[PDB]
């Protein structure tokens, strides 16, 4: 996990570790925590969407899988959605790992 954006004293930096941000760019510990909160907040929402759209290869019934397999995968999406879609993602998301 690296901070997708730290607005350091020398300006804005894209895709940077907490180490690199402080070491080279001289980012504040309040600027690290902020960017950490915000990278987490970005990751968890997008990650839920990733689990849906990446596993969409099973959801398209064109694939040659059993109804059981496709149902387990239709449950995979629906279980991620059964978990409340966390607005302002400041809670450790624990969701299903894929069956196959």
UniProtKB/TrEMBL annotation:
Domain Phage tail assembly chaperone-like, residue spans: 42-99
Pfam families associated with the record: Phage_tail_APC
InterPro entries hit by this protein: Phage_tail_APC (IPR031893)
Protein name: Phage tail assembly chaperone-like domain-containing protein
Organism: Chromobacterium violaceum (strain ATCC 12472 / DSM 30191 / JCM 1249 / CCUG 213 / NBRC 12614 / NCIMB 9131 / NCTC 9757 / MK)
């Amino acid at each position: 996990m690296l901070l997708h954006s730290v607005e350091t004293p020398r300006g804005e930096i894209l895709n940077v570790s907490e180490q690199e941000a402080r070491d080279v760019f001289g980012a504040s510990e309040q600027a690290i925590a902020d960017a950490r909160k915000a990278t987490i907040l970005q990751t968890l929402r997008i990650e839920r969407d990733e689990r849906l759209r990446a596993c969409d290869w099973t959801q398209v019934q064109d694939v040659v899988l059993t109804a059981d397999q496709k149902a387990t995968w239709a449950k995979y999406r629906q279980a991620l959605r059964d978990l409340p879609e966390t607005v302002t993602d400041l809670s450790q998301i624990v969701w299903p790992q894929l069956p196959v």
